[PDB]
Design a protein around this ligand. Structure first.
Ligand SMILES: CCc1cncnc1N1CCN(Cc2nc3cc(C(F)(F)F)ccc3[nH]2)CC1
Ligand SMILES: [Zn+2]
Length: 299
């Protein structure tokens, strides 16, 4: 086929994991010459032998293509070789939202709000398509050139060191995970709303709501779920967090049949013009067998 590995110059490694790597790359051939993409390359070997890893990989692929959205990373090309799979996604030059909080320490509510709003929309869309994002750590969120939010990660675990064997649910940080996920006791889209809460808190205070002095101590905190709000938070922020961070998933705001709408309604968001926001016209605060794998965009 017309698209092949040799169509992209390798600029540098963005990530190394067990399932493969990510590169910053430049396109050599004519289609979008000299344009920058991110190449995700997976080891067919690691994957085909495992039915789970395989299905997860096919789902990642379907999703990045069946699902076009302004706050969801765009897939540009996909293709395979012998023993490798290739996803060419837009390069997100603004880095992780993580990095932003890192240097900021704390966001101003306005800044916090903007991000959470975009992310809220992205979540509403996925939920609509029966998709649950699952882990909303500040690293699953990235920013394009224009400082807008993009949802990143639907694929295989990115670690080289995993949590145990069997599963990759807990391989990275658990700070932003809903309690039910920690008990493996069921779950659904409500878990995302928890996570949004945990994100909001971290943004507004500079630490996740239940950081313990270690991972185990951290876990125990999440299950206890004794929520302490700092006195500096506006009553809205206070209220929203009180409703997102509920142990009982059923009562969690947005857990209901109103989903994202329930959350987007909240007074914490009075200054968001959703229509404008989705149109990305809103000043941002910063900046076996893999048969029909082969793919080229538009669409
Ligand atoms: C792909 C979207 C993106 C766009 N623009 C710039 N940066 C990006 N990323 C996406 C997030 N990413 C973290 C990461 N994911 C990985 C997945 C693997 C895997 F091969 F799947 F095992 C290995 C290492 C990985 N490191 C690095 C930078
Ligand atoms: Zn893992």
């Amino acid at each position: 086929e017309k698209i092949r590995p040799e169509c992209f110059e390798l600029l540098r490694v963005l990530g190394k994991g067990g399932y493969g790597k990510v590169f910053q790359v430049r396109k050599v051939t004519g289609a979008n010459t000299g344009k920058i993409f991110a190449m995700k390359v997976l080891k067919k070997a690691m994957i085909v032998r495992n039915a789970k890893d395989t299905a997860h990989t096919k789902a990642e692929r379907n999703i990045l293509e069946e699902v076009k959205h302004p706050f969801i990373v765009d897939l540009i090309y996909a293709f395979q070789t012998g023993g490798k799979l290739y996803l060419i996604l837009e390069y997100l030059s603004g880095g992780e939202l993580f990095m932003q909080l890192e240097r900021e320490g704390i966001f101003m509510e306005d800044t916090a709000c903007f991000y959470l709003a975009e992310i809220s929309m992205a979540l509403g869309h996925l939920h609509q398509k029966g998709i649950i994002y699952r882990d909303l750590k500040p690293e699953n969120i990235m920013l394009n050139h224009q400082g807008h939010v993009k949802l990143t990660d639907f694929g295989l675990c990115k670690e080289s060191i995993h949590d145990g064997t069997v599963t990759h649910t807990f391989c990275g940080t658990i700070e932003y995970m809903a309690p039910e996920i920690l008990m493996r006791s069921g779950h659904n889209r409500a878990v995302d709303w928890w996570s949004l809460g945990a994100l909001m808190y971290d943004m507004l205070t500079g630490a996740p709501p239940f950081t313990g002095e270690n991972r185990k101590k951290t876990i125990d905190k999440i299950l206890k779920c004794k929520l302490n709000l700092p006195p500096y938070l506006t009553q809205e922020a206070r209220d929203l967090l009180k409703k997102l961070l509920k142990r009982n998933a059923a009562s969690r705001l947005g857990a209901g049949p109103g989903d994202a709408g329930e959350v987007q309604a909240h007074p914490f968001f009075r200054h968001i013009n959703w229509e404008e926001l989705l149109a990305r016209k809103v000043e941002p605060p910063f900046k076996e067998m893999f048969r029909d794998f082969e793919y080229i965009a538009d669409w």
